[PDB]
Design a binder for this molecule. Structure first.
Ligand SMILES: CCCC(=O)NCc1cccs1
Lengths: 237, 300
Protein backbone atom coordinates (compact mmCIF):
# COMPACT_ATOMS: atom_id res chain seq x y z
CA UNK A 1 0.00 0.00 0.00
CA UNK A 2 0.98 3.62 0.56
CA UNK A 3 4.26 4.73 2.10
CA UNK A 4 3.92 7.06 5.09
CA UNK A 5 5.22 7.94 8.57
CA UNK A 6 4.19 4.58 10.02
CA UNK A 7 6.25 2.40 7.65
CA UNK A 8 9.24 4.72 7.26
CA UNK A 9 11.88 2.20 8.31
CA UNK A 10 10.97 0.00 5.33
CA UNK A 11 12.99 2.39 3.16
CA UNK A 12 16.22 1.22 4.76
CA UNK A 13 15.72 -2.54 4.77
CA UNK A 14 17.38 -4.92 2.34
CA UNK A 15 14.63 -5.13 -0.34
CA UNK A 16 15.80 -2.99 -3.25
CA UNK A 17 13.54 0.01 -3.84
CA UNK A 18 13.57 3.23 -5.81
CA UNK A 19 11.79 6.56 -5.38
CA UNK A 20 10.79 8.22 -8.65
CA UNK A 21 10.09 11.95 -8.70
CA UNK A 22 8.81 13.52 -11.91
CA UNK A 23 8.45 17.08 -10.72
CA UNK A 24 11.37 18.38 -12.77
CA UNK A 25 10.77 16.42 -15.99
CA UNK A 26 8.74 19.08 -17.85
CA UNK A 27 10.03 22.55 -17.00
CA UNK A 28 9.02 25.78 -18.75
CA UNK A 29 9.47 29.51 -18.59
CA UNK A 30 6.23 31.42 -19.27
CA UNK A 31 6.65 34.60 -21.34
CA UNK A 32 4.86 37.17 -23.48
CA UNK A 33 4.76 37.01 -27.28
CA UNK A 34 5.26 39.99 -29.57
CA UNK A 35 1.48 40.07 -29.97
CA UNK A 36 1.01 40.21 -26.20
CA UNK A 37 -0.13 36.60 -25.80
CA UNK A 38 1.56 34.13 -23.45
CA UNK A 39 3.72 31.21 -24.48
CA UNK A 40 5.98 28.67 -22.82
CA UNK A 41 9.57 27.78 -23.60
CA UNK A 42 10.72 24.41 -22.34
CA UNK A 43 14.08 23.97 -20.63
CA UNK A 44 15.96 20.76 -19.90
CA UNK A 45 14.57 18.58 -17.15
CA UNK A 46 15.34 15.40 -15.29
CA UNK A 47 13.85 12.30 -13.72
CA UNK A 48 15.01 11.87 -10.12
CA UNK A 49 15.25 8.12 -9.40
CA UNK A 50 16.83 7.38 -6.03
CA UNK A 51 17.74 4.26 -4.01
CA UNK A 52 17.20 5.55 -0.44
CA UNK A 53 19.30 2.77 1.09
CA UNK A 54 22.46 3.24 -1.00
CA UNK A 55 22.17 6.86 -2.18
CA UNK A 56 22.38 5.74 -5.83
CA UNK A 57 20.69 8.51 -7.94
CA UNK A 58 19.93 7.61 -11.63
CA UNK A 59 19.47 11.17 -13.03
CA UNK A 60 17.93 10.85 -16.49
CA UNK A 61 18.24 14.19 -18.22
CA UNK A 62 15.20 15.07 -20.35
CA UNK A 63 16.32 17.22 -23.26
CA UNK A 64 13.88 19.77 -24.65
CA UNK A 65 13.99 18.00 -28.03
CA UNK A 66 11.79 15.24 -26.60
CA UNK A 67 8.87 17.71 -26.51
CA UNK A 68 9.21 18.92 -30.11
CA UNK A 69 5.92 18.61 -31.98
CA UNK A 70 4.14 16.95 -29.10
CA UNK A 71 0.83 17.95 -27.52
CA UNK A 72 -0.43 17.79 -23.92
CA UNK A 73 3.11 17.89 -22.59
CA UNK A 74 2.26 17.66 -18.88
CA UNK A 75 0.47 14.38 -19.60
CA UNK A 76 3.23 13.14 -21.90
CA UNK A 77 5.83 13.94 -19.25
CA UNK A 78 4.31 11.32 -16.94
CA UNK A 79 4.39 8.63 -19.62
CA UNK A 80 7.94 9.56 -20.71
CA UNK A 81 8.99 9.30 -17.06
CA UNK A 82 7.41 5.84 -16.87
CA UNK A 83 9.07 4.82 -20.15
CA UNK A 84 12.54 5.88 -18.91
CA UNK A 85 12.10 4.22 -15.49
CA UNK A 86 11.01 0.99 -17.19
CA UNK A 87 14.01 1.19 -19.55
CA UNK A 88 16.29 1.70 -16.52
CA UNK A 89 14.88 -1.34 -14.75
CA UNK A 90 15.31 -3.47 -17.88
CA UNK A 91 18.92 -2.28 -18.14
CA UNK A 92 19.80 -3.47 -14.62
CA UNK A 93 20.88 -7.05 -13.88
CA UNK A 94 18.07 -9.13 -12.41
CA UNK A 95 19.64 -9.06 -8.95
CA UNK A 96 19.75 -5.24 -9.02
CA UNK A 97 16.19 -4.68 -10.17
CA UNK A 98 13.93 -3.12 -7.52
CA UNK A 99 11.22 -5.04 -5.74
CA UNK A 100 9.25 -1.78 -5.26
CA UNK A 101 9.10 1.62 -6.97
CA UNK A 102 7.63 4.44 -4.88
CA UNK A 103 6.29 7.42 -6.91
CA UNK A 104 6.24 10.77 -5.18
CA UNK A 105 3.10 11.87 -7.11
CA UNK A 106 -0.03 9.73 -7.49
CA UNK A 107 -0.44 10.67 -11.12
CA UNK A 108 2.60 8.50 -11.93
CA UNK A 109 0.87 5.33 -10.72
CA UNK A 110 -1.02 4.35 -13.85
CA UNK A 111 1.69 5.39 -16.35
CA UNK A 112 4.31 3.43 -14.44
CA UNK A 113 2.04 0.42 -13.84
CA UNK A 114 1.34 0.14 -17.59
CA UNK A 115 5.00 0.49 -18.58
CA UNK A 116 5.96 -2.16 -16.04
CA UNK A 117 3.42 -4.83 -17.06
CA UNK A 118 6.38 -7.08 -17.95
CA UNK A 119 7.40 -6.91 -14.25
CA UNK A 120 4.33 -8.11 -12.32
CA UNK A 121 6.38 -8.77 -9.21
CA UNK A 122 7.56 -5.14 -8.88
CA UNK A 123 5.18 -3.23 -6.63
CA UNK A 124 4.32 0.33 -7.68
CA UNK A 125 3.44 2.34 -4.59
CA UNK A 126 2.35 5.89 -3.79
CA UNK A 127 3.38 7.81 -0.71
CA UNK A 128 1.63 10.10 1.77
CA UNK A 129 4.89 11.94 2.47
CA UNK A 130 5.55 15.44 1.18
CA UNK A 131 9.06 14.70 0.03
CA UNK A 132 11.23 17.63 -1.08
CA UNK A 133 12.76 16.03 -4.16
CA UNK A 134 11.68 18.90 -6.42
CA UNK A 135 14.54 20.88 -4.83
CA UNK A 136 17.12 18.60 -6.51
CA UNK A 137 17.72 21.32 -9.09
CA UNK A 138 18.90 23.50 -6.22
CA UNK A 139 21.97 21.22 -5.97
CA UNK A 140 24.44 23.15 -8.12
CA UNK A 141 26.18 20.19 -9.74
CA UNK A 142 22.87 18.51 -10.65
CA UNK A 143 21.42 21.73 -12.06
CA UNK A 144 24.64 22.28 -14.04
CA UNK A 145 24.61 18.90 -15.77
CA UNK A 146 20.91 19.18 -16.66
CA UNK A 147 21.22 22.65 -18.16
CA UNK A 148 24.38 21.85 -20.15
CA UNK A 149 22.97 18.71 -21.77
CA UNK A 150 22.63 18.86 -25.53
CA UNK A 151 21.08 15.38 -25.89
CA UNK A 152 19.34 12.80 -23.70
CA UNK A 153 21.77 11.56 -21.09
CA UNK A 154 21.82 9.44 -17.92
CA UNK A 155 24.15 10.66 -15.15
CA UNK A 156 24.98 8.62 -12.01
CA UNK A 157 25.55 10.32 -8.61
CA UNK A 158 25.64 9.13 -5.01
CA UNK A 159 23.44 11.79 -3.35
CA UNK A 160 24.88 10.92 0.08
CA UNK A 161 28.51 11.55 -0.93
CA UNK A 162 30.55 9.38 1.52
CA UNK A 163 28.17 9.82 4.44
CA UNK A 164 27.39 6.08 4.69
CA UNK A 165 30.99 5.49 5.85
CA UNK A 166 29.99 7.21 9.10
CA UNK A 167 26.15 7.15 9.41
CA UNK A 168 23.27 4.80 8.65
CA UNK A 169 20.96 5.05 5.64
CA UNK A 170 18.12 6.20 7.90
CA UNK A 171 20.25 9.09 9.14
CA UNK A 172 21.56 9.84 5.65
CA UNK A 173 18.06 10.04 4.19
CA UNK A 174 16.95 12.24 7.09
CA UNK A 175 19.88 14.58 6.40
CA UNK A 176 19.10 14.63 2.68
CA UNK A 177 15.40 15.41 3.20
CA UNK A 178 16.30 18.14 5.70
CA UNK A 179 18.73 19.76 3.29
CA UNK A 180 16.30 19.60 0.42
CA UNK A 181 13.37 20.84 2.50
CA UNK A 182 15.54 23.83 3.49
CA UNK A 183 16.54 24.47 -0.11
CA UNK A 184 12.88 24.28 -1.13
CA UNK A 185 11.65 26.64 1.58
CA UNK A 186 14.38 29.31 1.20
CA UNK A 187 17.06 28.47 -1.35
CA UNK A 188 19.14 31.59 -0.76
CA UNK A 189 19.34 31.20 3.02
CA UNK A 190 19.89 27.45 2.66
CA UNK A 191 22.75 27.96 0.23
CA UNK A 192 24.24 30.68 2.46
CA UNK A 193 24.27 28.24 5.39
CA UNK A 194 26.05 25.55 3.38
CA UNK A 195 28.80 27.74 1.88
CA UNK A 196 29.29 30.51 4.46
CA UNK A 197 32.67 29.15 5.63
CA UNK A 198 35.13 29.33 2.70
CA UNK A 199 37.37 26.73 4.40
CA UNK A 200 34.90 23.83 3.94
CA UNK A 201 34.96 22.68 0.33
CA UNK A 202 33.02 20.33 -1.94
CA UNK A 203 35.17 17.51 -3.24
CA UNK A 204 35.22 17.20 -7.00
CA UNK A 205 33.46 13.80 -6.73
CA UNK A 206 30.83 15.05 -4.22
CA UNK A 207 27.68 17.15 -4.20
CA UNK A 208 27.76 18.59 -0.67
CA UNK A 209 30.53 20.11 1.48
CA UNK A 210 32.98 17.98 3.46
CA UNK A 211 31.65 18.71 6.94
CA UNK A 212 32.95 17.00 10.02
CA UNK A 213 30.47 15.16 12.20
CA UNK A 214 30.36 18.15 14.54
CA UNK A 215 29.91 20.59 11.68
CA UNK A 216 26.98 18.55 10.32
CA UNK A 217 25.19 18.92 13.65
CA UNK A 218 25.65 22.68 13.46
CA UNK A 219 24.53 22.67 9.81
CA UNK A 220 21.52 20.47 10.49
CA UNK A 221 20.52 22.77 13.33
CA UNK A 222 20.75 25.83 11.08
CA UNK A 223 18.53 24.12 8.48
CA UNK A 224 15.87 23.30 11.08
CA UNK A 225 15.95 26.92 12.26
CA UNK A 226 15.47 28.07 8.65
CA UNK A 227 12.46 25.81 8.12
CA UNK A 228 10.70 27.01 11.29
CA UNK A 229 11.62 30.64 10.57
CA UNK A 230 10.20 30.59 7.04
CA UNK A 231 7.20 28.91 8.62
CA UNK A 232 6.91 31.99 10.83
CA UNK A 233 7.63 34.52 8.08
CA UNK A 234 5.05 32.67 5.99
CA UNK A 235 2.36 32.18 8.67
CA UNK A 236 3.34 35.13 10.94
CA UNK A 237 4.02 33.24 14.18
CA UNK B 1 -46.71 -18.97 -28.11
CA UNK B 2 -45.06 -21.46 -25.71
CA UNK B 3 -45.67 -22.58 -22.16
CA UNK B 4 -43.59 -23.38 -19.10
CA UNK B 5 -45.78 -25.49 -16.80
CA UNK B 6 -45.17 -25.88 -13.07
CA UNK B 7 -45.73 -29.16 -11.32
CA UNK B 8 -46.84 -27.22 -8.22
CA UNK B 9 -45.94 -24.28 -5.96
CA UNK B 10 -45.20 -25.76 -2.52
CA UNK B 11 -43.41 -22.69 -1.09
CA UNK B 12 -44.39 -19.03 -1.26
CA UNK B 13 -42.28 -17.34 -3.91
CA UNK B 14 -42.09 -14.29 -6.11
CA UNK B 15 -41.77 -15.53 -9.70
CA UNK B 16 -40.36 -13.37 -12.46
CA UNK B 17 -40.65 -13.96 -16.17
CA UNK B 18 -38.48 -11.51 -18.10
CA UNK B 19 -39.31 -8.03 -16.74
CA UNK B 20 -42.62 -9.16 -15.16
CA UNK B 21 -43.21 -10.71 -11.76
CA UNK B 22 -45.97 -12.01 -9.53
CA UNK B 23 -46.43 -13.50 -6.08
CA UNK B 24 -47.46 -17.12 -5.50
CA UNK B 25 -48.60 -18.16 -2.06
CA UNK B 26 -47.61 -21.37 -0.28
CA UNK B 27 -49.44 -24.30 -1.93
CA UNK B 28 -51.49 -21.92 -4.09
CA UNK B 29 -52.86 -23.71 -7.18
CA UNK B 30 -50.39 -22.51 -9.79
CA UNK B 31 -49.31 -24.49 -12.84
CA UNK B 32 -47.21 -22.18 -14.93
CA UNK B 33 -46.81 -19.48 -17.52
CA UNK B 34 -48.38 -19.55 -20.97
CA UNK B 35 -48.29 -17.32 -24.08
CA UNK B 36 -44.50 -16.82 -23.90
CA UNK B 37 -43.34 -15.11 -27.10
CA UNK B 38 -41.37 -17.24 -29.44
CA UNK B 39 -38.20 -15.79 -30.94
CA UNK B 40 -36.45 -14.45 -27.86
CA UNK B 41 -34.53 -15.92 -25.00
CA UNK B 42 -36.37 -15.66 -21.71
CA UNK B 43 -35.50 -15.86 -18.03
CA UNK B 44 -37.69 -17.28 -15.30
CA UNK B 45 -36.57 -16.28 -11.84
CA UNK B 46 -37.37 -16.80 -8.22
CA UNK B 47 -37.14 -15.16 -4.82
CA UNK B 48 -38.47 -17.15 -1.92
CA UNK B 49 -40.64 -15.27 0.54
CA UNK B 50 -38.77 -16.64 3.56
CA UNK B 51 -35.19 -16.12 2.32
CA UNK B 52 -34.93 -13.10 0.05
CA UNK B 53 -31.29 -14.18 -0.04
CA UNK B 54 -30.51 -15.90 -3.34
CA UNK B 55 -32.44 -14.67 -6.29
CA UNK B 56 -31.94 -17.45 -8.86
CA UNK B 57 -33.36 -18.47 -12.22
CA UNK B 58 -33.06 -20.03 -15.66
CA UNK B 59 -32.31 -18.68 -19.12
CA UNK B 60 -34.09 -20.67 -21.82
CA UNK B 61 -35.41 -20.54 -25.39
CA UNK B 62 -38.65 -22.47 -25.97
CA UNK B 63 -37.51 -23.33 -29.51
CA UNK B 64 -34.86 -25.66 -28.06
CA UNK B 65 -37.13 -27.97 -26.08
CA UNK B 66 -40.09 -28.36 -23.76
CA UNK B 67 -39.21 -27.05 -20.30
CA UNK B 68 -41.07 -27.17 -17.00
CA UNK B 69 -40.51 -26.19 -13.36
CA UNK B 70 -40.70 -28.54 -10.38
CA UNK B 71 -39.86 -27.75 -6.76
CA UNK B 72 -37.18 -29.98 -5.20
CA UNK B 73 -37.73 -30.22 -1.40
CA UNK B 74 -34.24 -31.68 -0.88
CA UNK B 75 -32.26 -28.90 -2.58
CA UNK B 76 -34.97 -26.40 -1.67
CA UNK B 77 -35.48 -24.69 -4.97
CA UNK B 78 -37.63 -24.55 -8.06
CA UNK B 79 -35.71 -26.45 -10.77
CA UNK B 80 -36.08 -26.27 -14.51
CA UNK B 81 -36.18 -29.60 -16.32
CA UNK B 82 -36.62 -30.75 -19.93
CA UNK B 83 -39.50 -33.06 -20.85
CA UNK B 84 -38.40 -35.22 -23.77
CA UNK B 85 -41.80 -36.98 -24.23
CA UNK B 86 -43.50 -34.51 -26.56
CA UNK B 87 -46.99 -36.00 -26.26
CA UNK B 88 -46.81 -36.20 -22.48
CA UNK B 89 -45.88 -32.50 -22.41
CA UNK B 90 -48.58 -31.25 -24.78
CA UNK B 91 -51.07 -33.25 -22.75
CA UNK B 92 -49.92 -31.75 -19.45
CA UNK B 93 -50.10 -28.21 -20.81
CA UNK B 94 -53.46 -28.55 -22.54
CA UNK B 95 -54.99 -29.84 -19.26
CA UNK B 96 -53.56 -26.97 -17.16
CA UNK B 97 -54.78 -24.43 -19.72
CA UNK B 98 -58.24 -26.01 -19.72
CA UNK B 99 -58.28 -25.59 -15.94
CA UNK B 100 -57.01 -21.98 -16.30
CA UNK B 101 -54.27 -22.52 -13.74
CA UNK B 102 -51.59 -20.58 -15.67
CA UNK B 103 -50.64 -16.92 -15.81
CA UNK B 104 -50.34 -15.33 -19.22
CA UNK B 105 -47.10 -13.68 -20.31
CA UNK B 106 -48.50 -10.18 -20.16
CA UNK B 107 -47.00 -8.45 -23.17
CA UNK B 108 -48.59 -5.22 -24.37
CA UNK B 109 -48.63 -5.13 -28.16
CA UNK B 110 -46.91 -1.73 -28.49
CA UNK B 111 -44.13 -2.88 -26.18
CA UNK B 112 -40.70 -3.73 -27.56
CA UNK B 113 -38.90 -3.62 -24.19
CA UNK B 114 -37.92 -7.28 -24.02
CA UNK B 115 -36.78 -7.38 -27.65
CA UNK B 116 -34.75 -4.25 -27.04
CA UNK B 117 -33.06 -5.73 -23.96
CA UNK B 118 -32.27 -9.10 -25.61
CA UNK B 119 -31.72 -8.07 -29.26
CA UNK B 120 -28.24 -9.66 -29.49
CA UNK B 121 -28.57 -12.31 -26.75
CA UNK B 122 -28.47 -15.89 -28.06
CA UNK B 123 -28.90 -19.09 -26.05
CA UNK B 124 -25.85 -20.64 -27.66
CA UNK B 125 -23.66 -17.85 -26.30
CA UNK B 126 -25.34 -17.92 -22.88
CA UNK B 127 -24.42 -21.61 -22.66
CA UNK B 128 -20.73 -20.80 -23.22
CA UNK B 129 -20.79 -18.21 -20.44
CA UNK B 130 -22.76 -20.60 -18.17
CA UNK B 131 -21.26 -24.06 -18.71
CA UNK B 132 -23.57 -27.02 -17.99
CA UNK B 133 -23.74 -28.83 -21.28
CA UNK B 134 -26.18 -31.55 -20.23
CA UNK B 135 -29.00 -28.95 -20.05
CA UNK B 136 -30.44 -26.72 -22.78
CA UNK B 137 -31.22 -23.98 -20.23
CA UNK B 138 -28.81 -22.07 -17.96
CA UNK B 139 -28.96 -21.49 -14.19
CA UNK B 140 -27.77 -18.19 -12.74
CA UNK B 141 -28.00 -16.79 -9.21
CA UNK B 142 -27.00 -13.81 -7.06
CA UNK B 143 -23.81 -15.36 -5.67
CA UNK B 144 -22.12 -16.83 -8.76
CA UNK B 145 -18.70 -15.33 -9.41
CA UNK B 146 -17.04 -14.63 -12.72
CA UNK B 147 -13.84 -16.17 -14.06
CA UNK B 148 -12.13 -12.80 -13.64
CA UNK B 149 -13.41 -12.44 -10.07
CA UNK B 150 -11.93 -15.87 -9.29
CA UNK B 151 -8.51 -14.78 -10.61
CA UNK B 152 -8.26 -11.96 -8.04
CA UNK B 153 -13.54 -20.42 -6.28
CA UNK B 154 -15.58 -23.33 -7.72
CA UNK B 155 -15.00 -23.24 -11.51
CA UNK B 156 -18.06 -25.35 -12.44
CA UNK B 157 -20.35 -22.67 -10.94
CA UNK B 158 -18.70 -19.65 -12.62
CA UNK B 159 -19.78 -17.03 -15.12
CA UNK B 160 -17.24 -17.28 -17.96
CA UNK B 161 -17.55 -13.75 -19.24
CA UNK B 162 -14.78 -12.49 -21.50
CA UNK B 163 -12.05 -11.04 -19.30
CA UNK B 164 -11.46 -7.32 -19.89
CA UNK B 165 -8.57 -5.69 -18.03
CA UNK B 166 -7.37 -2.22 -19.06
CA UNK B 167 -3.92 -2.60 -17.42
CA UNK B 168 -2.96 -5.92 -18.98
CA UNK B 169 -0.63 -7.05 -21.71
CA UNK B 170 -3.65 -8.07 -23.78
CA UNK B 171 -4.82 -4.45 -23.66
CA UNK B 172 -1.48 -2.69 -24.19
CA UNK B 173 0.83 -3.15 -27.18
CA UNK B 174 4.55 -3.00 -26.30
CA UNK B 175 5.72 0.45 -27.32
CA UNK B 176 2.20 1.88 -27.51
CA UNK B 177 1.70 2.06 -23.74
CA UNK B 178 0.41 5.63 -23.52
CA UNK B 179 -1.39 5.42 -26.84
CA UNK B 180 -3.28 2.22 -26.05
CA UNK B 181 -4.12 3.16 -22.46
CA UNK B 182 -5.57 6.55 -23.30
CA UNK B 183 -7.29 5.37 -26.55
CA UNK B 184 -8.48 1.77 -26.26
CA UNK B 185 -9.44 1.43 -29.94
CA UNK B 186 -6.86 -1.28 -30.68
CA UNK B 187 -8.07 -3.35 -27.72
CA UNK B 188 -11.73 -2.84 -28.73
CA UNK B 189 -11.46 -3.35 -32.49
CA UNK B 190 -8.52 -5.72 -32.95
CA UNK B 191 -8.24 -7.74 -29.74
CA UNK B 192 -11.89 -7.95 -28.76
CA UNK B 193 -14.10 -7.42 -31.81
CA UNK B 194 -11.96 -9.00 -34.54
CA UNK B 195 -10.15 -11.50 -32.32
CA UNK B 196 -12.42 -12.77 -29.56
CA UNK B 197 -16.03 -11.82 -30.28
CA UNK B 198 -15.69 -11.91 -34.10
CA UNK B 199 -18.41 -9.22 -34.54
CA UNK B 200 -20.21 -6.43 -32.66
CA UNK B 201 -23.37 -8.54 -32.34
CA UNK B 202 -21.69 -11.09 -30.07
CA UNK B 203 -20.11 -8.24 -28.06
CA UNK B 204 -23.49 -6.57 -27.52
CA UNK B 205 -25.03 -9.94 -26.68
CA UNK B 206 -22.64 -10.48 -23.80
CA UNK B 207 -23.04 -6.85 -22.69
CA UNK B 208 -26.83 -7.28 -22.64
CA UNK B 209 -26.66 -10.62 -20.81
CA UNK B 210 -24.32 -9.16 -18.19
CA UNK B 211 -26.77 -6.30 -17.56
CA UNK B 212 -29.74 -8.64 -17.26
CA UNK B 213 -27.97 -10.87 -14.73
CA UNK B 214 -26.98 -7.77 -12.77
CA UNK B 215 -30.57 -6.49 -12.76
CA UNK B 216 -32.49 -9.69 -12.18
CA UNK B 217 -30.17 -11.43 -9.72
CA UNK B 218 -28.08 -8.62 -8.25
CA UNK B 219 -25.05 -10.44 -9.57
CA UNK B 220 -22.15 -8.11 -8.76
CA UNK B 221 -19.63 -9.62 -11.17
CA UNK B 222 -22.14 -9.25 -13.98
CA UNK B 223 -22.52 -5.56 -13.15
CA UNK B 224 -18.72 -5.22 -13.29
CA UNK B 225 -18.71 -6.88 -16.71
CA UNK B 226 -21.51 -4.67 -18.08
CA UNK B 227 -19.69 -1.50 -17.04
CA UNK B 228 -16.35 -2.74 -18.38
CA UNK B 229 -17.83 -3.43 -21.80
CA UNK B 230 -19.40 0.03 -21.88
CA UNK B 231 -16.21 1.71 -20.76
CA UNK B 232 -14.13 -0.13 -23.38
CA UNK B 233 -16.33 1.33 -26.13
CA UNK B 234 -16.54 4.86 -24.71
CA UNK B 235 -12.75 4.98 -24.16
CA UNK B 236 -12.04 4.17 -27.81
CA UNK B 237 -11.59 7.11 -30.17
CA UNK B 238 -12.33 4.95 -33.21
CA UNK B 239 -15.62 3.03 -33.11
CA UNK B 240 -17.79 2.12 -36.12
CA UNK B 241 -20.68 4.56 -36.45
CA UNK B 242 -23.23 1.72 -36.41
CA UNK B 243 -21.93 0.35 -33.12
CA UNK B 244 -22.22 3.74 -31.41
CA UNK B 245 -25.74 4.25 -32.63
CA UNK B 246 -26.70 0.77 -31.47
CA UNK B 247 -24.94 1.15 -28.11
CA UNK B 248 -27.00 4.29 -27.45
CA UNK B 249 -30.20 2.32 -28.06
CA UNK B 250 -29.02 -0.59 -25.95
CA UNK B 251 -28.17 1.50 -22.92
CA UNK B 252 -31.26 3.65 -23.27
CA UNK B 253 -33.53 0.63 -22.79
CA UNK B 254 -31.35 -0.73 -19.97
CA UNK B 255 -31.53 2.56 -18.09
CA UNK B 256 -35.25 2.84 -18.86
CA UNK B 257 -35.93 -0.62 -17.42
CA UNK B 258 -33.75 -0.39 -14.29
CA UNK B 259 -35.85 -0.14 -11.11
CA UNK B 260 -35.38 3.41 -9.83
CA UNK B 261 -34.70 2.19 -6.30
CA UNK B 262 -31.79 -0.07 -7.42
CA UNK B 263 -29.79 2.60 -9.26
CA UNK B 264 -27.58 3.38 -6.26
CA UNK B 265 -25.92 -0.07 -6.33
CA UNK B 266 -26.28 -1.04 -10.00
CA UNK B 267 -24.83 2.15 -11.55
CA UNK B 268 -21.12 2.97 -11.23
CA UNK B 269 -20.77 6.75 -10.95
CA UNK B 270 -17.25 6.85 -12.35
CA UNK B 271 -17.98 4.87 -15.50
CA UNK B 272 -21.14 6.78 -16.37
CA UNK B 273 -19.71 10.24 -15.74
CA UNK B 274 -16.60 9.31 -17.73
CA UNK B 275 -18.62 7.80 -20.58
CA UNK B 276 -21.18 10.60 -20.90
CA UNK B 277 -19.02 13.64 -20.10
CA UNK B 278 -15.27 12.91 -20.48
CA UNK B 279 -14.77 10.06 -22.94
CA UNK B 280 -14.26 10.12 -26.68
CA UNK B 281 -17.91 9.16 -27.10
CA UNK B 282 -19.23 11.84 -24.70
CA UNK B 283 -21.27 13.23 -27.63
CA UNK B 284 -22.34 9.98 -29.29
CA UNK B 285 -24.91 8.70 -26.74
CA UNK B 286 -27.69 11.27 -27.01
CA UNK B 287 -30.62 9.06 -26.05
CA UNK B 288 -28.75 7.48 -23.15
CA UNK B 289 -27.49 10.85 -21.87
CA UNK B 290 -30.98 12.35 -21.98
CA UNK B 291 -32.65 9.52 -20.03
CA UNK B 292 -29.81 9.39 -17.49
CA UNK B 293 -30.03 13.16 -16.90
CA UNK B 294 -33.83 13.10 -16.45
CA UNK B 295 -33.99 9.91 -14.37
CA UNK B 296 -30.74 9.77 -12.33
CA UNK B 297 -29.31 13.31 -12.19
CA UNK B 298 -28.00 12.66 -8.66
CA UNK B 299 -25.49 10.11 -9.93
CA UNK B 300 -23.94 12.78 -12.17
C1 LIG C 1 28.90 7.37 -10.58
C2 LIG C 1 29.78 7.87 -9.44
C3 LIG C 1 30.41 6.68 -8.71
C4 LIG C 1 29.34 5.95 -7.92
O1 LIG C 1 29.00 6.31 -6.81
N1 LIG C 1 28.77 4.84 -8.52
C5 LIG C 1 27.72 4.05 -7.87
C6 LIG C 1 26.43 4.40 -8.48
C7 LIG C 1 25.68 3.64 -9.30
C8 LIG C 1 24.50 4.33 -9.72
C9 LIG C 1 24.42 5.55 -9.20
S1 LIG C 1 25.73 5.92 -8.21
Amino acid sequence: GAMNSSNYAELFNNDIKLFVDDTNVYRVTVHKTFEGNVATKAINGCIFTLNPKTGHLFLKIIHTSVWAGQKRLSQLAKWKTAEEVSALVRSLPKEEQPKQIIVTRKAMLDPLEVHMLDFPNIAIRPTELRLPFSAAMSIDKLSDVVMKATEPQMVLFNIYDDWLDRISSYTAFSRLTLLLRALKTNEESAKMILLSDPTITIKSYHLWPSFTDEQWITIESQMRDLILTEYGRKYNV
Amino acid sequence: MNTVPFTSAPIEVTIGIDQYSFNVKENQPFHGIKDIPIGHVHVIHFQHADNSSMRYGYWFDCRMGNFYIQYDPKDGLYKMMEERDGAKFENIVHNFKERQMMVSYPKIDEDDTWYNLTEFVQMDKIRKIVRKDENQFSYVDSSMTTVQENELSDPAHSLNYTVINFKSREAIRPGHEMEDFLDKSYYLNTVMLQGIFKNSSNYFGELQFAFLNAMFFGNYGSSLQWHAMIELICSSATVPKHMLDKLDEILYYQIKTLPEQYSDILLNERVWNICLYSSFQKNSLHNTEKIMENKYPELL
